[PDB]
Amino acid sequence: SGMQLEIQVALNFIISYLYNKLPRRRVNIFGEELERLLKKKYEGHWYPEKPYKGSGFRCIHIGEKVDPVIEQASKESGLDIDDVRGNLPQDLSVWIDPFEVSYQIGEKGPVKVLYVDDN
79 close to 27: Cβ distance less than 8 angstroms: yes
Say which experimental method was used: X-ray
The topology (CATH level 3) of 1-119 is: Actin; Chain A, domain 4 (3.90.640)
Round to whole Å and give the CA distance between 98 and 65: 25
CA trace torsion 38, 73, 13, 7 (10° rounding): -20
> What are the residue ranges spanned by the domains of the chain?
1-119
Q: Which residues contact 32 (CB under 8 A, 6 or more apart)?
A: 77
Q: What is the DSSP secondary structure assignment for residue 66, as one 8-state letter? A: B
Distance CA 56, CA 51 (A): 11
With b for 16 or more beta-carbon neighbours within 10 A and e for fewer, the 15-35 pattern comes to bebbeeebeeebbeebbebbb
Resolution value (Å, 1 decimal):
2.3
